[PDB]
Amino acid sequence: YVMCTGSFKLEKEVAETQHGTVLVQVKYEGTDAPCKIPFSTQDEKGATQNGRLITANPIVTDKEKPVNIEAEPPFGESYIVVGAGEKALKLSWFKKG
Amino acid sequence: QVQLLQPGAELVKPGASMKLSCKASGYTFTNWWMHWVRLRPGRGLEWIGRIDPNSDVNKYNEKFENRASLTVDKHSSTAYMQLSSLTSEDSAIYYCARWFFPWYFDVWGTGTTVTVSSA
Amino acid sequence: NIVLTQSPASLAVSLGQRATISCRASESVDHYGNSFIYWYQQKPGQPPKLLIYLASNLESGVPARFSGSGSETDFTLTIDSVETDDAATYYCQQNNEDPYTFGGGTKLEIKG
Ligand SMILES: [Cl-]
Ligand SMILES: [Cl-]
Ligand SMILES: [Cl-]
Ligand SMILES: [Cl-]
The full set of domains in chain A, from first to last, is: 1-97 (2.60.40.350)
CATH top class, domain C1-112:
mainly beta
- Kindly give the distance from the C-alpha atom of residue B111 to the centroid of ligand 3, in angstroms, as a whole number: 8
Partner C contacted by B46 (CB < 8 A)? yes
Q: Which chains touch C (3 or more CB pairs under 8 A)?
A: A, B
- Kindly give the distance from the C-alpha atom of residue C32 to the centroid of ligand 3, in angstroms, as a whole number: 34
Rounded CA separation C18/C7 (Å): 15
Å resolution of this model? Answer: 2.5
Rounded CA separation B49/C103 (Å): 17
Separation in Å, CA C84 to CA A25, C81, C88: 47, 10, 10
Partner A contacted by C33 (CB < 8 A)? yes
Nearest Cα neighbor of B5 from B72, B78, B91 is B78
Residues A51, A53, A7, CA angle at the centre, nearest 5°?
100
Residue B78: domain span: 1-119
Q: Is residue B90 classed as helix, strand or coil in its secondary structure?
A: helix
Partner C contacted by B8 (CB < 8 A)? no
For residue B43, the domain's CATH number is: 2.60.40.10
Neighbouring C-beta atoms of residue B17, cutoff 10 Å:
13
**Phi, psi at C10, each rounded to 5°:** -150, 160
> Which experimental method was this entry solved with?
X-ray
b/e map of B85-95 (b: 16 or more CB within 10 Å)? Answer: ebeeebbbbbb
Find the CB nearest C38 among B37, B44, B103: B103
**Choosing among C95, C101, C106, which should be mutated to test the B contact, i.e. which has the most B CBs within 10 A?**
C95
Domain range summary for chain C, segments of one domain joined by +:
1-112
Find the CB nearest B47 among C100, C104, C105: C100
Nearest ligand to residue C48 Cα: 3
Contact B104 C53 (CB under 8 A): yes
Nearest Cα neighbor of B116 from B93, B80, B83, B90 is B90
Rounded CA separation C41/C105 (Å): 9
Nearest Cα neighbor of A7 from A69, A94, A82 is A82
Torsion angle defined by CA atoms of residues C17, C102, B51 and A97, in that order, rounded to the nearest 10 degrees: 110
Rounded CA separation A37/A60 (Å): 7
Nearest Cα neighbor of B92 from B50, B35, B36 is B36
Partner A contacted by B2 (CB < 8 A)? no
The CA radius of gyration of chain C, in Å to the nearest whole number, is 13
Contact B44 C105 (CB under 8 A): yes
Instruction: Please give the tally of structural domains in chain B.
Output: 1
Nearest CA of chain C to the CA of B112: how many Å?
10
Rounded CA separation A80/C55 (Å): 22
